[PDB]
Ligand binder design. Structure first.
Ligand SMILES: Cc1cc2nc3c(=O)[nH]c(=O)nc-3n(C[C@H](O)[C@H](O)[C@H](O)COP(=O)(O)OP(=O)(O)OC[C@H]3O[C@@H](n4cnc5c(N)ncnc54)[C@H](O)[C@@H]3O)c2cc1C
Ligand SMILES: Cc1cc2nc3c(=O)[nH]c(=O)nc-3n(C[C@H](O)[C@H](O)[C@H](O)COP(=O)(O)OP(=O)(O)OC[C@H]3O[C@@H](n4cnc5c(N)ncnc54)[C@H](O)[C@@H]3O)c2cc1C
Ligand SMILES: O=C(O)/C=C/c1c[nH]cn1
Ligand SMILES: O=C(O)/C=C/c1c[nH]cn1
Ligand SMILES: [Cl-]
Ligand SMILES: [Cl-]
Ligand SMILES: [Cl-]
Ligand SMILES: [Cl-]
Ligand code: NA
Ligand code: NA
Lengths: 454, 454
């Protein structure tokens, strides 16, 4: 079997969907090939919070922002190693990208909630309904079906097809044990995500991130797009810069979105029954703090009063069930029971929470200077979750220009080849800020589909 | 020539002076040997700001603090690698150390000023009169003369004397081209400071910090105390952790205390005439930001209105004269002249300052979110200073216990040998917080003199 389309997109995450919808809208034929049996990749299981300076939600909330500040925040976050034009183009197109999600894809965002990720000077992360990428990918899928964008699941790209001029003119893919050739008349878009779930690639570029660490990502995040492009002499950069997320499942590696309760008053408790870091510190600080605790894990503890504001249990019931079945999470009536289930010294936990309750009442955390104010934890019920850092995002990847054209080892455009999303390596410097992956994948996914369609 | 004292102290910085005064006060004979022609080492040229949780000045200013928070701040600052008992003993003795400086040494601190160094959750750095160590070392010197503590300048310790039991029983030193033997009946205190000015030792332990970087320290900061103790099998740790200070002379390496005006409204301007980092960001962030600018330097720009509050020109007139003579600093009437003297694009500088003036008026810095509020810079005169990062403090050094006893490679006490101050390597982890060196050198200097005298 062979197929022919104008634009062949590899991957059904936010970057690939954005490229596909733009290619179809330009009047071209397009397909997305997806190696998993389900669509959406890490974009699906993402929190999908998306930074935008100058959003309609900021206006609703009375929050002032500027592109200049979003750019400076972002460049600083990556230790000033990100490509300034890549960051500028991301920020310059972020409002349009989010309004396009709202108006064209019909993604629903909360009109009056924003998150301020570490490193951002103001609250600027839009929040999709449900606080996950489920809303985003489901709406993308509906819109793709409406406009006539086919998605071929269980179809694994294995090789880029390069003609004698050096132009990329298609993709060889595996489906049901056979090779299928996808001819691409105008362009191939690599939108395959990162390599957080490729242990050998992690160890090659960052030996510390070995089998001691899980991955927050899906099993398909294995760097295939980098490997396939390097075979035809695409350049890569920043491959060793790989970030972790602090509060993840010790068993599966999955992120614990349910533990976003720490932004609403949950406390981090070590095996000794003691707090050990400000719960609102930067994520890398929290990760290092946890790895310095006994056993290299923490507990996250909160009560019904916090859930009634935060809703992270209601919003992440699959995590609740999975973590509970894995023995990583308990719902308990009393702090004494919270200590018992995890062999935490009872007297120390009770003393810690007595202090927390006093700090909540005064607004002054005399142990760690909690920046927003603690919440009284004297009454339950309680959730207590065991968590540890897990590998989360690969900042490195393919070298592209701001038009998403992939460049070779001499900086020359590889004709017919584009790349967008976590597979690229020039936006985030040494360290991506929270909420900036979604901005990157939508902005550059759209550009890639536009450029491939030309 | 030979001398005999109960306690022989090597170095006349804050650690050595503290040890000497305690030894004399215990009723023992003591001497300080100092290799330079002047006393005070880096403690002399320090800002000498000293962190204390629970000081009389905090009480005057209505500021609440706690030892728990000072400990947690400190441990976090060094990436959780500092020795917890060393940090606890430092914090537990900080109030007593500062009250001892005030009441016994007669150091004058401002009663109503404190500095909040990066990483500290509350304002807690006491400020000596004059905003330098000159006050501290001059008062130490007077007190030493009053109590009968001799200081032998131009006397360089070269070898520790070890008897057949393994006990350290003296020091061989060079003076006027001859070797002088100092017999120590009860103890030798190594208080020799750090190795920021030893290029070969820097390169050995941190190859990046080579000849591209100057040193903020005096010429005597060469690691001699580490070398002399390792010869008799003292252990060392954390030697590769070496911190820089962001705003220093590109010619001499000296710190620019005069540029503490950035805590009162001065702006950082690159060669392009643009701001590029929040001026109140963490020092390591500022250092990296500067090294990312054209030429790897910044300018620091402020006006008379800022000086009338900050006083950093009045307090650091020697810097003013030296930097000006070196072509690194100008006093100018207009922003146009500030641009001219350093070949900064005039239009860009004027546009940058127009923005600053608007941000000062509104309190909202739309470019970098200055956390305290900018100050109008429309009227002069102005100072503009060229600055770059310089090597500043060596966190590593000798292994001691909390009694300042030096330990060998098997963790065993070396009898008769003590060490205190920047020469030790267990307090600050990977990164010392501002103001914490002075706390360390006084607390542990006092302990070392007390323990050596026993
Ligand atoms: C749990 C989690 C939470 C996150 N939360 C946030 C957040 O709130 N905000 C934020 O900004 N970022 C967040 N991130 C990061 C962000 O979600 C991702 O970086 C981003 O979604 C990646 O999008 P993408 O389109 O590049 O790739 P993906 O979404 O990973 O999609 C790539 C797709 O390509 C497919 N593919 C790969 N190789 C092949 C091949 N050979 N053939 C065919 N198909 C292939 C994969 O199967 C996958 O479906 C989160 C990440 C995770 C894991
Ligand atoms: C410019 C500057 C500003 C600073 N500002 C601050 C600040 O505000 N707050 C803060 O907390 N920290 C600050 N620091 C750091 C702090 O001042 C130092 O870490 C601290 O003063 C070191 O004290 P010390 O007693 O260990 O050593 P030093 O003060 O360096 O004294 C050691 C002495 O031993 C002598 N010596 C060395 N080898 C020999 C030998 N072989 N024989 C004899 N004598 C020898 C040296 O000549 C020197 O005089 C600053 C540092 C500098 C350089
Ligand atoms: O890594 C990110 O950008 C966001 C992670 C996250 C956590 N909770 C919601 N999103
Ligand atoms: O490095 C420190 O602890 C302090 C440096 C400084 C700058 N200005 C006054 N002190
Ligand atoms: Cl703007
Ligand atoms: Cl690289
Ligand atoms: Cl206290
Ligand atoms: Cl070490
Ligand atoms: Na990447
Ligand atoms: Na040290």
């Amino acid at each position: 079997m062979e197929y022919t389309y104008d634009v062949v997109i590899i991957g059904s995450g936010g970057a690939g969907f954005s490229a596909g919808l733009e290619a179809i809208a330009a009047g071209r034929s397009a397909v997305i090939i997806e190696k998993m049996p389900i669509i959406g990749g890490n974009s699906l299981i993402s929190g999908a919070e998306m930074n935008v300076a100058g959003s309609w939600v900021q206006k609703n909330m009375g929050i002032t922002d500027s592109k200049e500040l979003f750019i400076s925040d972002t460049l600083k976050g990556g230790d000033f190693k990100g490509d300034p034009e890549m960051v500028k183009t991301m920020v310059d197109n972020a409002v349009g990208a989010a309004e396009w999600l709202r108006d064209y894809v019909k993604v629903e965002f909360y009109p009056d909630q924003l998150f301020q990720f570490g490193g951002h000077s103001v609250k600027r992360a839009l929040i999709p309904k449900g606080h996950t990428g489920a809303e985003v990918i489901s709406k993308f899928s509906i819109k793709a079906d409406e406009v006539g964008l086919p998605i071929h699941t269980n179809t694994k790209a294995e090789k880029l097809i390069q003609d004698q001029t050096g132009r990329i003119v298609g993709v060889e893919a595996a489906h049901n044990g056979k090779t299928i050739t996808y001819h691409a008349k105008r362009g191939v878009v690599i939108a395959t995500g990162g390599f957080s779930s490729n242990m050998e690639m992690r160890k090659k570029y960052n030996p510390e991130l070995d089998e001691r660490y899980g991955s927050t990502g899906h099993a398909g995040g294995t760097g295939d797009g980098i490997v396939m492009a390097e075979k035809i002499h695409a350049a890569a950069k920043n491959m060793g810069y790989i970030q972790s997320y602090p509060i993840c499942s010790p068993t599966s590696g999955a992120i614990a979105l349910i533990a976003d309760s720490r932004f609403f008053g949950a406390v981090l408790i070590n095996q000794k029954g003691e707090r050990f870091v400000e719960e609102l510190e930067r994520r890398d600080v929290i990760s290092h703090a946890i790895l310095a605790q006994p056993g290299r894990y923490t507990y996250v503890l909160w009560n019904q009063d916090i859930e009634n504001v935060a809703h992270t249990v209601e919003m992440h019931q699959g995590e609740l069930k999975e973590f509970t079945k894995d023995g990583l999470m308990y719902k308990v009536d009393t702090l004494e029971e919270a200590a018992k289930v995890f062999n935490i010294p009872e007297d120390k936990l009770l003393s810690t929470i007595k202090d927390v309750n006093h700090y909540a009442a005064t607004g002054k955390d005399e142990a760690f200077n909690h920046r927003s104010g603690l919440v009284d934890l004297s009454k339950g019920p309680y959730w207590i979750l065991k968590a540890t850092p897990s590998v989360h995002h690969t900042m490195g990847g393919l070298v592209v220009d701001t038009r998403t054209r992939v460049l070779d080892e001499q900086g020359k455009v590889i004709p017919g080849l584009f790349a967008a999303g976590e597979v690229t390596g020039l936006t985030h410097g040494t360290n991506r800020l929270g909420g900036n992956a979604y901005t990157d994948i939508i902005v550059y996914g759209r550009i890639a589909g536009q450029e491939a369609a030309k």
